[model samples]
Target: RENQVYSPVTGARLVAGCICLTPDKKQVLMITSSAHKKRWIVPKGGVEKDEPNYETTAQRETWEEAGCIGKIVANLGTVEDMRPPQFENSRKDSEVAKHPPRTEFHFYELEIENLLDKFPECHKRHRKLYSYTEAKQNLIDAKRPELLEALNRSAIIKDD
Candidate 1:
């Protein structure tokens, strides 16, 4: 097997993504969901090929997708299969086999250093910042709860 730095935790696909917030924690950054035109999601991609670790993976994904640069502040926690992959019945056999029915996502917290006017994926994706509550509305309805759990674990959604 030619596997290269692919992460697997608890038998879950080593996928990592990030959540960026305004300094006051009033806003959460989101981007166009590549899968759908009207949907939104936090930046994320799977760990592969020389990635140092999940934190680095999330930091990288956010830079490319959201064009937000910053460091990892916390591990939001891993979410298991936000949605069952059976919904992807259209996937080719090879594609289907490579991705499990349930995917586990490792999320990181980032205090964005800058929201770049130009960065990777700018031509392909649009970025938007939303309030704590607004971010939840924009994530796909079926996947709505997943991102928030990680948000709740962070200082962004402070608990009394």
Candidate 2:
């Protein structure tokens, strides 16, 4: 299972992630996206064959990418419709075989518990805290509308 490059995207492509926030829930933690751009994204990843479930996947990604322990305070459900047009949510094998990797995003509102100076991806990714408005602008610049939608869904930002 260690050699498996991806989780099954046959009928559905599943992804799990966290909307990591500061201890006071005033700021968001954004990390550089793996996408070849000078933009940022929240910590997220696919669940391979050897994984438990989405919650663990989200937490693991948060720790691996953001270098912090997070508590999932709320489940924000599936985020699918807001994906850009290029990311067409099709289950067709023909489309799946191509370069476009469509994903159905599941996000949780994560309140940061502890911060780590050194972690598995510390060298590859840089994590920083952002204010609600700043995170929105950055996510917009990142060309990630669904991430922005998920951010809006979080009550923490609304109540802020």
Candidate 3:
């Protein structure tokens, strides 16, 4: 029952996350995954049952994953076409092994108000701030086109 990673139910899994920006809006906060410390991603997680809405989920996940509290600037809408890779072990044995389907993510932009010295996942994750351009580059390097497209669409990053 515990520590088992199974195939998610057939349908979009509800996820809420943020493209967190610093006060000046020049830099965005990124956090490394606990499982893969080198992989960088925006603060995000599943929408919990008790959470009233995705907005609240976004705020809470940000605090837990990125160690910052912020105001939700705008609802950036939903991303339904993300094709992130499924881990090898997640595949079913009988199936003709192929990459799993896409994931749907609801993303927002948060203006960071405060950063904490400690948070729930602080020890498991590494957090950092990056310029929009740098964040885009890191996402590209990570081969996460969905994230890059979301950042591009957000239009927060200035063109030099």
Candidate 4:
């Protein structure tokens, strides 16, 4: 998707994300929406005009999409990625014209409070969990040399 040449647009919007980390720090809480981009991306949504702030939007997006409640742990960074909205819960054709033209996302780290289920299925949208191992393997599979940095920084767990 990146590097795709694009002309321009107007009347876009701003979106933010809360990248929740499992309390055990074993997985990166991501949402698997079966929309256009079918992959594990951070929970995100657009900021309403009368809404509170970006943080609130991040938290709300997580709840509305992933069905999980968590606290904001830390702020990682922001990624300016353009996204053309797609069908979420309802049918595809129902809301095509109402799609977001471009979106600006702010990614933050969130610590889950009461995540009892290992993998919670998304009733409204297609979503699930991606273990740390799975994410690391994905990076490896993609042949991204930067994955070595994660392996280098990975904590070494030992039996007591």
TM-score of 1: 0.78
TM per candidate comes to: 0.78, 0.78, 0.79, 0.58
lDDT of 3 by residue, 40-109 (tens): 8788877766777789888988998888997888888877544544334544544334544456677898
The sequence of per-residue lDDT tens digits that candidate 1 reaches over residues 1-160 is 4543433544556678988987777788888877785778788877777877788889888988888998777778888663544223554543233454255788988987799889889988889887766776666453667766777677775421
Question: How many backbone overlaps does candidate 4 show?
Answer: 0
RMSD of 1: 7.0
lDDT (10s digit) by residue, model 2, range 31-75: 997655489888888766677778988998888888889679999
Question: What ordering of candidates by TM-score runs from best to worst?
Answer: 3, 2, 1, 4
Clashing pairs in 2: none
lDDT of 2 at 75: 91
Residue 56 accuracy (lDDT) in model 1? 80
Error of 1 at 126 (Å): 1.1
- Those runs of model 4 whose alpha carbons end farther than 4 Å from true positions after fitting are 1-12, 82-101, 116-121, 136-160
Residues 1-160, candidate 4, lDDT per residue (tens digit)?
A: 2312222454545676666666776666555544644454556777766656678777777777777687776665544433344444465435433453454455567777754343334554555556766655544554432222322233312111
Indicate the residue-level lDDT of 103 in model 4: 43
Residue 37 lDDT, candidate 3, scale 0-100: 69
Go through the candidates in order and give the clash count of each: 0, 0, 0, 0
Instruction: State model 4's lDDT.
Output: 0.55
